[PDB]
Amino acid sequence: KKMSIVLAPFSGGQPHSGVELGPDYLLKQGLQQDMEKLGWDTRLERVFDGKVVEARKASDNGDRIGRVKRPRLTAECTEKIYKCVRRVAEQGRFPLTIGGDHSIALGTVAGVLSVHPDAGVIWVDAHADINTMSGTVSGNLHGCPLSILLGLDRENIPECFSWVPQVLKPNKIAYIGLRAVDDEEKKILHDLNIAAFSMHHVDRYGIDKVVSMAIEAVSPKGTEPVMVSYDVDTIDPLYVPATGTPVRGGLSFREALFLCERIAECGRLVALDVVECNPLLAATESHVNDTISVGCAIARCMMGETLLYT
Amino acid sequence: KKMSIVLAPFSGGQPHSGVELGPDYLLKQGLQQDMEKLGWDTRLERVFDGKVVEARKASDNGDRIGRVKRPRLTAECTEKIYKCVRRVAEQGRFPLTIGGDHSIALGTVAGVLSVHPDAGVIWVDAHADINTMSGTVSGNLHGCPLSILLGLDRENIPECFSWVPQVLKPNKIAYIGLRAVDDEEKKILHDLNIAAFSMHHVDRYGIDKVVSMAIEAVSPKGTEPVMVSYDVDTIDPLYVPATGTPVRGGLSFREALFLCERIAECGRLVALDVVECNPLLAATESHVNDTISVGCAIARCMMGETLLYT
Amino acid sequence: KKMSIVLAPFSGGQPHSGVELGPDYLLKQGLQQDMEKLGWDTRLERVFDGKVVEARKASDNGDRIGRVKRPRLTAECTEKIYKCVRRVAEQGRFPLTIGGDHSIALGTVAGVLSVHPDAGVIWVDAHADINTMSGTVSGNLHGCPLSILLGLDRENIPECFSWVPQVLKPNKIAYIGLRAVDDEEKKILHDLNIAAFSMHHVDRYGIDKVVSMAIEAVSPKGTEPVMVSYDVDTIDPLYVPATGTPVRGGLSFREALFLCERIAECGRLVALDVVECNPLLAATESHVNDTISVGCAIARCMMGETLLYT
Ligand SMILES: NCCC[C@H](N)C(=O)O
Ligand SMILES: NCCC[C@H](N)C(=O)O
Ligand SMILES: NCCC[C@H](N)C(=O)O
Ligand SMILES: [Mn+2]
Ligand SMILES: [Mn+2]
Ligand SMILES: [Mn+2]
Ligand SMILES: [Mn+2]
Ligand SMILES: [Mn+2]
Ligand SMILES: [Mn+2]
């Protein structure tokens, strides 16, 4: 039971500052101590310095191609994450990656699927993060991870993204908590027939059923390895006051946590990402002690922490 | 696919000011643009000036009969709504009426049922709005609409309400979200065996099931036309901070919206009212950008807006 | 239909001040008037003066045995509650006990089970309140009631607790709403195979199902008498801003109240405690008008108050 806590302080797909501090902030909440307690031989893994990267981020303002922003910077860092996470996996360690915006999933998913090819991917998020290079209206790369992993709009994908392995197939990615999907993305999910569970399904069926469905969706046979990429903005703002992309009708804190428990309960979780943690963006005290307190909770629950005896 | 957005700035059943501004406020949120986007040929229909009416409202303080207040003023305006909504319907247009307190439903329901006789009525509200003229303790007419449409307490109903057609039958009206029913009203619903779904049923069965039930209740045959009269105070205050009649245990914003989706999904919605929108009553910024933001959302969802591809 | 409203202003298991004012505060909300209205011949029963007890509480700082605090004071007062509640029961009256911290359940449960031996016990709480004398880390007795009633850790239980009857068996106590269980307690529930329903079960199954289960758990035959000991901290803080022991993921106000309705609906409720009501701890106005407004609501609903005709 070895685990590697991958620290990815990247704020590319994200505008300015805030989301790079997540890794450190989480670790301060005792994230590693919690993991050790749950019985995990934990080892940290710093893929790069958030302070330096954040630096070049601000200065370097000419990293663009179309409306797409920071292709070079984002391609450079996500490749390092891929490599790191890939080794961690090969070494037989569990990759727990702490972001950082959701653009890091480009290196995490690639990393995990490279070693675990038949692994399913449950994307817990309010957004589909599947805009293509030419489709993206905002150009923020944290909303285009999936389009790149799935190889959509190949023609328009940068040279700096040639390092991306084509290991993710549409029937291996399921969404949970969607409620802010762009028109372009709605057609994409439909056309590729991607198992997408929006807030409608949670309201209609309840979380338990949705998780069961999402799990079945990426697991033809009830034995496949499973990876969850958890965006904390999935959780309704009321619960995630310290983030940067929420809307009307998110998951309750209870649902957000129960979901984890059902996953831990499954017993086939192979990797986990926790992203979009912005302590700064929220000038209150119950705000900063949330996206990081929430992050640790998600981590603890995902990793087995239960309410009763286990 | 033609629609007529009926503007009814009436604040009769309502004490003083606030609820007459709803129509304009909604339109400012781009309500008509949203409707056009959803593919509706929309045409506005001003039934009267809220500024003038509001005026005579304040001055004219002697409009009473028993504890009942503003019978004359309320009978005068609701008849204009009836007429308007009736034509809109006959012209084959969809009546989307924006209030204004719930006393306008006296003219909306009458209008719609005059043209669509076998139409069912789903009253989404925290209150039953069925107090009789002699039964009403507060005399506020926004809490007596249904008693008049159903012809209860005929003897004590004013001459100014002679214009009201008797088109609504007890087995054609279903409630959803009830939690502030007056003793008198509880006996009335029971005696007339009206399908009433309070917050108890939502807690016990979940919203999806309740909507299904409410829909079945007013649709002997699964083909009848359906009309929803949506009171925004049904939504728990936490979600409707800008209204004027909520209590302990309302619908969540998610439920409030999912309900709409199930209705739009049904495909038999023939008319829709959105009432009790008081921007003023709530001195905050997330308050005024709610009962109007909520109203538009309800409208968009009721009219087909979905989270995924459609 | 006779009822005795037992006033227990005890703040032993509780640190300093606040929770002793609950009884008076509730009565001010018209608790007795509400009970009378629901058709209950109500009679108050003051077991002791909260002002005097609170007094000796502060001064007397040497009441200890191990980490356990106020054993003498807590043993003295809870015995008076037991006696009172026992008579009330024998007189055929319904004991509605208002605390006061949850340490009073030591005298309530004993009192009720003495007269109604086969009575089941539904403990609605965020905590298990089952730490043993030697197990308790904090020494606060409000977290050790159940260990004493069940006779756990006999060896280390004080002489001042010799008055406690051994009437409660493990298969006669069910939990609902658990989410803050100490490691020691988790093993205890498991080992004694106590029916425990945490927030996981509520999220997974919904409240209705949980209550049904809890009721079945303590009722081998669907006829046994039932007692509920309601800790208001079970209700998520958002709803219980005026308490002193909540965490992440409590019951919604709706659930908290629906639960009562299902219980009242059952028809076999024989006793009821409402505890952990701290008006003071919460310097707001919607806070103090909650743990007391909530308490009365719980009482009204538990005692039959419904949303529709009954
Ligand atoms: N990761 C959030 C995505 C937000 C939006 N769809 C975008 O493309 O920027
Ligand atoms: N429309 C709100 C109704 C409130 C109350 N039942 C009344 O008759 O005034
Ligand atoms: N009644 C609240 C219990 C809190 C904690 N388990 C304790 O033993 O103090
Ligand atoms: Mn994302
Ligand atoms: Mn997102
Ligand atoms: Mn109404
Ligand atoms: Mn209403
Ligand atoms: Mn307790
Ligand atoms: Mn407790």
mmCIF file of N, CA and C in Angstrom, chain C residues 147-237:
data_model
loop_
_atom_site.group_PDB
_atom_site.id
_atom_site.type_symbol
_atom_site.label_atom_id
_atom_site.label_comp_id
_atom_site.label_asym_id
_atom_site.label_seq_id
_atom_site.Cartn_x
_atom_site.Cartn_y
_atom_site.Cartn_z
ATOM 1 N N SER C 147 -23.024 4.347 27.305
ATOM 2 C CA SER C 147 -22.117 3.352 27.864
ATOM 3 C C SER C 147 -22.597 2.952 29.257
ATOM 4 N N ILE C 148 -23.158 3.917 29.977
ATOM 5 C CA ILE C 148 -23.666 3.693 31.330
ATOM 6 C C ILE C 148 -25.002 2.937 31.340
ATOM 7 N N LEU C 149 -25.904 3.298 30.437
ATOM 8 C CA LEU C 149 -27.200 2.634 30.354
ATOM 9 C C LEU C 149 -27.049 1.192 29.901
ATOM 10 N N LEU C 150 -26.046 0.942 29.064
ATOM 11 C CA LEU C 150 -25.790 -0.396 28.543
ATOM 12 C C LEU C 150 -24.865 -1.191 29.464
ATOM 13 N N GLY C 151 -24.356 -0.530 30.501
ATOM 14 C CA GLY C 151 -23.492 -1.195 31.468
ATOM 15 C C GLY C 151 -22.083 -1.532 31.017
ATOM 16 N N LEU C 152 -21.596 -0.788 30.036
ATOM 17 C CA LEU C 152 -20.265 -1.017 29.512
ATOM 18 C C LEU C 152 -19.230 -0.451 30.476
ATOM 19 N N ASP C 153 -18.109 -1.159 30.600
ATOM 20 C CA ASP C 153 -17.020 -0.733 31.470
ATOM 21 C C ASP C 153 -17.540 -0.595 32.901
ATOM 22 N N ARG C 154 -18.262 -1.614 33.365
ATOM 23 C CA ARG C 154 -18.831 -1.618 34.714
ATOM 24 C C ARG C 154 -17.766 -1.250 35.735
ATOM 25 N N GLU C 155 -16.695 -2.032 35.722
ATOM 26 C CA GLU C 155 -15.568 -1.850 36.617
ATOM 27 C C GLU C 155 -15.261 -0.390 36.918
ATOM 28 N N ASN C 156 -15.179 0.428 35.875
ATOM 29 C CA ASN C 156 -14.833 1.838 36.043
ATOM 30 C C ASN C 156 -15.966 2.842 36.214
ATOM 31 N N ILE C 157 -17.194 2.360 36.382
ATOM 32 C CA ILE C 157 -18.321 3.268 36.578
ATOM 33 C C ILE C 157 -18.439 3.600 38.075
ATOM 34 N N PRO C 158 -18.492 4.907 38.409
ATOM 35 C CA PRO C 158 -18.595 5.471 39.763
ATOM 36 C C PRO C 158 -19.703 4.920 40.651
ATOM 37 N N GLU C 159 -19.541 5.129 41.953
ATOM 38 C CA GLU C 159 -20.516 4.680 42.934
ATOM 39 C C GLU C 159 -21.757 5.560 42.771
ATOM 40 N N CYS C 160 -21.536 6.829 42.436
ATOM 41 C CA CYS C 160 -22.640 7.760 42.250
ATOM 42 C C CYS C 160 -23.582 7.371 41.097
ATOM 43 N N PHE C 161 -23.226 6.328 40.341
ATOM 44 C CA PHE C 161 -24.057 5.858 39.225
ATOM 45 C C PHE C 161 -24.638 4.482 39.502
ATOM 46 N N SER C 162 -24.663 4.110 40.773
ATOM 47 C CA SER C 162 -25.198 2.816 41.170
ATOM 48 C C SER C 162 -26.714 2.802 41.020
ATOM 49 N N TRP C 163 -27.312 3.992 41.022
ATOM 50 C CA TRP C 163 -28.763 4.142 40.915
ATOM 51 C C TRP C 163 -29.313 3.832 39.532
ATOM 52 N N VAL C 164 -28.416 3.698 38.561
ATOM 53 C CA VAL C 164 -28.817 3.431 37.188
ATOM 54 C C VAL C 164 -29.310 2.009 36.933
ATOM 55 N N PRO C 165 -30.600 1.856 36.581
ATOM 56 C CA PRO C 165 -31.167 0.529 36.304
ATOM 57 C C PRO C 165 -30.584 -0.017 34.997
ATOM 58 N N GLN C 166 -30.422 -1.336 34.921
ATOM 59 C CA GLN C 166 -29.906 -1.967 33.712
ATOM 60 C C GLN C 166 -31.093 -2.474 32.892
ATOM 61 N N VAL C 167 -31.743 -1.546 32.198
ATOM 62 C CA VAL C 167 -32.909 -1.870 31.391
ATOM 63 C C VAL C 167 -32.678 -1.789 29.873
ATOM 64 N N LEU C 168 -31.584 -1.154 29.452
ATOM 65 C CA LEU C 168 -31.316 -0.996 28.021
ATOM 66 C C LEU C 168 -30.382 -2.040 27.420
ATOM 67 N N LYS C 169 -30.878 -2.749 26.410
ATOM 68 C CA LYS C 169 -30.100 -3.764 25.701
ATOM 69 C C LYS C 169 -29.709 -3.211 24.326
ATOM 70 N N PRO C 170 -28.514 -3.573 23.835
ATOM 71 C CA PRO C 170 -27.941 -3.160 22.544
ATOM 72 C C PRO C 170 -28.864 -3.258 21.318
ATOM 73 N N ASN C 171 -29.699 -4.289 21.282
ATOM 74 C CA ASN C 171 -30.626 -4.493 20.176
ATOM 75 C C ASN C 171 -31.906 -3.688 20.371
ATOM 76 N N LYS C 172 -31.878 -2.744 21.303
ATOM 77 C CA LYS C 172 -33.048 -1.914 21.563
ATOM 78 C C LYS C 172 -32.708 -0.439 21.349
ATOM 79 N N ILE C 173 -31.511 -0.183 20.831
ATOM 80 C CA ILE C 173 -31.079 1.179 20.565
ATOM 81 C C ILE C 173 -30.576 1.296 19.128
ATOM 82 N N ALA C 174 -31.153 2.238 18.386
ATOM 83 C CA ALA C 174 -30.782 2.480 16.995
ATOM 84 C C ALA C 174 -30.370 3.939 16.816
ATOM 85 N N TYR C 175 -29.337 4.178 16.018
ATOM 86 C CA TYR C 175 -28.854 5.536 15.780
ATOM 87 C C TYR C 175 -29.268 6.077 14.417
ATOM 88 N N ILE C 176 -29.452 7.390 14.324
ATOM 89 C CA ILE C 176 -29.790 8.017 13.047
ATOM 90 C C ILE C 176 -29.121 9.384 12.935
ATOM 91 N N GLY C 177 -28.284 9.548 11.910
ATOM 92 C CA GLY C 177 -27.622 10.824 11.683
ATOM 93 C C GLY C 177 -26.171 10.904 12.097
ATOM 94 N N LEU C 178 -25.613 9.780 12.547
ATOM 95 C CA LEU C 178 -24.222 9.726 12.997
ATOM 96 C C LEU C 178 -23.193 10.186 11.975
ATOM 97 N N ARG C 179 -22.222 10.958 12.447
ATOM 98 C CA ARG C 179 -21.172 11.451 11.575
ATOM 99 C C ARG C 179 -19.949 11.947 12.346
ATOM 100 N N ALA C 180 -19.972 11.813 13.669
ATOM 101 C CA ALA C 180 -18.838 12.232 14.502
ATOM 102 C C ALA C 180 -18.602 11.186 15.593
ATOM 103 N N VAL C 181 -18.294 9.970 15.159
ATOM 104 C CA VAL C 181 -18.061 8.849 16.053
ATOM 105 C C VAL C 181 -16.571 8.670 16.355
ATOM 106 N N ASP C 182 -16.227 8.551 17.639
ATOM 107 C CA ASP C 182 -14.831 8.364 18.036
ATOM 108 C C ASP C 182 -14.413 6.927 17.747
ATOM 109 N N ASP C 183 -13.135 6.728 17.442
ATOM 110 C CA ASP C 183 -12.624 5.398 17.126
ATOM 111 C C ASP C 183 -13.127 4.356 18.117
ATOM 112 N N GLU C 184 -12.999 4.671 19.396
ATOM 113 C CA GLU C 184 -13.430 3.770 20.450
ATOM 114 C C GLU C 184 -14.884 3.380 20.239
ATOM 115 N N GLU C 185 -15.714 4.382 19.949
ATOM 116 C CA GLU C 185 -17.145 4.179 19.746
ATOM 117 C C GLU C 185 -17.470 3.348 18.515
ATOM 118 N N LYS C 186 -16.671 3.499 17.465
ATOM 119 C CA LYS C 186 -16.899 2.742 16.240
ATOM 120 C C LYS C 186 -16.761 1.249 16.501
ATOM 121 N N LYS C 187 -15.761 0.878 17.297
ATOM 122 C CA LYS C 187 -15.529 -0.529 17.625
ATOM 123 C C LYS C 187 -16.654 -1.051 18.529
ATOM 124 N N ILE C 188 -17.105 -0.203 19.452
ATOM 125 C CA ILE C 188 -18.181 -0.548 20.385
ATOM 126 C C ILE C 188 -19.492 -0.878 19.667
ATOM 127 N N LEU C 189 -19.903 -0.005 18.752
ATOM 128 C CA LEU C 189 -21.130 -0.219 17.997
ATOM 129 C C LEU C 189 -21.022 -1.525 17.216
ATOM 130 N N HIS C 190 -19.877 -1.710 16.569
ATOM 131 C CA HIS C 190 -19.618 -2.901 15.772
ATOM 132 C C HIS C 190 -19.678 -4.170 16.609
ATOM 133 N N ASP C 191 -18.901 -4.189 17.689
ATOM 134 C CA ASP C 191 -18.851 -5.341 18.575
ATOM 135 C C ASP C 191 -20.205 -5.696 19.179
ATOM 136 N N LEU C 192 -20.988 -4.692 19.555
ATOM 137 C CA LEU C 192 -22.298 -4.959 20.144
ATOM 138 C C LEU C 192 -23.363 -5.048 19.059
ATOM 139 N N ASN C 193 -22.908 -4.926 17.815
ATOM 140 C CA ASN C 193 -23.775 -4.986 16.655
ATOM 141 C C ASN C 193 -25.006 -4.090 16.813
ATOM 142 N N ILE C 194 -24.770 -2.840 17.208
ATOM 143 C CA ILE C 194 -25.840 -1.859 17.399
ATOM 144 C C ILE C 194 -26.276 -1.273 16.052
ATOM 145 N N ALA C 195 -27.586 -1.237 15.805
ATOM 146 C CA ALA C 195 -28.101 -0.688 14.555
ATOM 147 C C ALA C 195 -27.751 0.798 14.498
ATOM 148 N N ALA C 196 -26.757 1.131 13.686
ATOM 149 C CA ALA C 196 -26.314 2.507 13.564
ATOM 150 C C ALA C 196 -26.484 3.006 12.139
ATOM 151 N N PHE C 197 -27.213 4.100 11.990
ATOM 152 C CA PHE C 197 -27.421 4.670 10.679
ATOM 153 C C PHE C 197 -26.767 6.036 10.662
ATOM 154 N N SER C 198 -25.637 6.117 9.968
ATOM 155 C CA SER C 198 -24.877 7.351 9.867
ATOM 156 C C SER C 198 -25.395 8.176 8.700
ATOM 157 N N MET C 199 -24.745 9.304 8.438
ATOM 158 C CA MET C 199 -25.143 10.155 7.332
ATOM 159 C C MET C 199 -24.953 9.419 6.003
ATOM 160 N N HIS C 200 -24.066 8.425 5.988
ATOM 161 C CA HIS C 200 -23.822 7.638 4.783
ATOM 162 C C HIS C 200 -25.134 6.984 4.346
ATOM 163 N N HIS C 201 -25.815 6.352 5.297
ATOM 164 C CA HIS C 201 -27.078 5.673 5.026
ATOM 165 C C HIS C 201 -28.183 6.633 4.583
ATOM 166 N N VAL C 202 -28.186 7.841 5.131
ATOM 167 C CA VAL C 202 -29.194 8.825 4.760
ATOM 168 C C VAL C 202 -28.937 9.272 3.331
ATOM 169 N N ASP C 203 -27.662 9.478 2.999
ATOM 170 C CA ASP C 203 -27.276 9.888 1.653
ATOM 171 C C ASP C 203 -27.555 8.751 0.682
ATOM 172 N N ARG C 204 -27.222 7.547 1.108
ATOM 173 C CA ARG C 204 -27.406 6.395 0.255
ATOM 174 C C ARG C 204 -28.858 5.982 0.087
ATOM 175 N N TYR C 205 -29.613 5.984 1.177
ATOM 176 C CA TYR C 205 -30.998 5.535 1.129
ATOM 177 C C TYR C 205 -32.108 6.567 1.247
ATOM 178 N N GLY C 206 -31.793 7.766 1.709
ATOM 179 C CA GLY C 206 -32.843 8.749 1.887
ATOM 180 C C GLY C 206 -33.383 8.565 3.295
ATOM 181 N N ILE C 207 -33.873 9.645 3.890
ATOM 182 C CA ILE C 207 -34.366 9.603 5.257
ATOM 183 C C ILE C 207 -35.519 8.637 5.538
ATOM 184 N N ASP C 208 -36.526 8.643 4.675
ATOM 185 C CA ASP C 208 -37.689 7.785 4.861
ATOM 186 C C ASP C 208 -37.269 6.344 5.153
ATOM 187 N N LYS C 209 -36.455 5.781 4.271
ATOM 188 C CA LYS C 209 -35.982 4.411 4.422
ATOM 189 C C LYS C 209 -35.219 4.207 5.728
ATOM 190 N N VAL C 210 -34.366 5.171 6.074
ATOM 191 C CA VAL C 210 -33.584 5.064 7.299
ATOM 192 C C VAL C 210 -34.481 4.977 8.527
ATOM 193 N N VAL C 211 -35.462 5.863 8.606
ATOM 194 C CA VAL C 211 -36.367 5.854 9.744
ATOM 195 C C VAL C 211 -37.072 4.501 9.818
ATOM 196 N N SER C 212 -37.537 4.018 8.673
ATOM 197 C CA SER C 212 -38.205 2.730 8.639
ATOM 198 C C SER C 212 -37.258 1.694 9.222
ATOM 199 N N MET C 213 -36.018 1.702 8.756
ATOM 200 C CA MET C 213 -35.052 0.739 9.249
ATOM 201 C C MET C 213 -34.825 0.874 10.744
ATOM 202 N N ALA C 214 -34.542 2.089 11.203
ATOM 203 C CA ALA C 214 -34.311 2.334 12.626
ATOM 204 C C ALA C 214 -35.493 1.833 13.454
ATOM 205 N N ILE C 215 -36.705 2.102 12.984
ATOM 206 C CA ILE C 215 -37.891 1.663 13.701
ATOM 207 C C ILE C 215 -37.955 0.136 13.750
ATOM 208 N N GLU C 216 -37.671 -0.521 12.628
ATOM 209 C CA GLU C 216 -37.707 -1.980 12.586
ATOM 210 C C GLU C 216 -36.644 -2.582 13.487
ATOM 211 N N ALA C 217 -35.479 -1.941 13.512
ATOM 212 C CA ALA C 217 -34.342 -2.385 14.311
ATOM 213 C C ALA C 217 -34.627 -2.577 15.798
ATOM 214 N N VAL C 218 -35.385 -1.662 16.393
ATOM 215 C CA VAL C 218 -35.692 -1.741 17.819
ATOM 216 C C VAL C 218 -37.062 -2.347 18.095
ATOM 217 N N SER C 219 -37.708 -2.827 17.039
ATOM 218 C CA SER C 219 -39.028 -3.419 17.162
ATOM 219 C C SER C 219 -39.124 -4.802 16.536
ATOM 220 N N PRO C 220 -38.618 -5.840 17.237
ATOM 221 C CA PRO C 220 -38.661 -7.217 16.734
ATOM 222 C C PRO C 220 -40.050 -7.443 16.147
ATOM 223 N N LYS C 221 -41.069 -7.148 16.952
ATOM 224 C CA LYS C 221 -42.463 -7.243 16.534
ATOM 225 C C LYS C 221 -42.904 -5.797 16.273
ATOM 226 N N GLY C 222 -43.637 -5.574 15.190
ATOM 227 C CA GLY C 222 -44.047 -4.218 14.862
ATOM 228 C C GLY C 222 -45.006 -3.566 15.830
ATOM 229 N N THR C 223 -44.884 -3.898 17.106
ATOM 230 C CA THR C 223 -45.778 -3.354 18.116
ATOM 231 C C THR C 223 -45.122 -2.660 19.313
ATOM 232 N N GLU C 224 -43.815 -2.842 19.486
ATOM 233 C CA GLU C 224 -43.115 -2.250 20.622
ATOM 234 C C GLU C 224 -43.232 -0.746 20.798
ATOM 235 N N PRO C 225 -43.157 -0.284 22.058
ATOM 236 C CA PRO C 225 -43.242 1.139 22.387
ATOM 237 C C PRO C 225 -41.951 1.766 21.870
ATOM 238 N N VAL C 226 -42.005 3.031 21.468
ATOM 239 C CA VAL C 226 -40.806 3.684 20.966
ATOM 240 C C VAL C 226 -40.489 5.025 21.615
ATOM 241 N N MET C 227 -39.212 5.214 21.909
ATOM 242 C CA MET C 227 -38.734 6.436 22.510
ATOM 243 C C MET C 227 -37.657 7.034 21.629
ATOM 244 N N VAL C 228 -37.724 8.342 21.434
ATOM 245 C CA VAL C 228 -36.724 9.025 20.643
ATOM 246 C C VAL C 228 -36.014 10.022 21.544
ATOM 247 N N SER C 229 -34.696 10.082 21.425
ATOM 248 C CA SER C 229 -33.887 11.022 22.186
ATOM 249 C C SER C 229 -33.259 11.843 21.062
ATOM 250 N N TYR C 230 -33.788 13.048 20.866
ATOM 251 C CA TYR C 230 -33.370 13.930 19.783
ATOM 252 C C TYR C 230 -32.332 14.990 20.145
ATOM 253 N N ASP C 231 -31.130 14.847 19.591
ATOM 254 C CA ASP C 231 -30.073 15.821 19.823
ATOM 255 C C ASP C 231 -30.192 16.769 18.635
ATOM 256 N N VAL C 232 -30.410 18.050 18.910
ATOM 257 C CA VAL C 232 -30.560 19.034 17.843
ATOM 258 C C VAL C 232 -29.301 19.272 17.009
ATOM 259 N N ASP C 233 -28.149 18.802 17.482
ATOM 260 C CA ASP C 233 -26.907 18.977 16.728
ATOM 261 C C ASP C 233 -26.849 17.995 15.554
ATOM 262 N N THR C 234 -27.858 17.132 15.458
ATOM 263 C CA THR C 234 -27.936 16.164 14.370
ATOM 264 C C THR C 234 -28.189 16.959 13.099
ATOM 265 N N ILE C 235 -28.990 18.011 13.252
ATOM 266 C CA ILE C 235 -29.365 18.892 12.158
ATOM 267 C C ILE C 235 -28.161 19.722 11.753
ATOM 268 N N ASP C 236 -27.871 19.731 10.458
ATOM 269 C CA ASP C 236 -26.725 20.462 9.951
ATOM 270 C C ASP C 236 -26.726 21.881 10.504
ATOM 271 N N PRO C 237 -25.554 22.361 10.954
ATOM 272 C CA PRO C 237 -25.336 23.696 11.527
ATOM 273 C C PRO C 237 -26.106 24.791 10.802
#
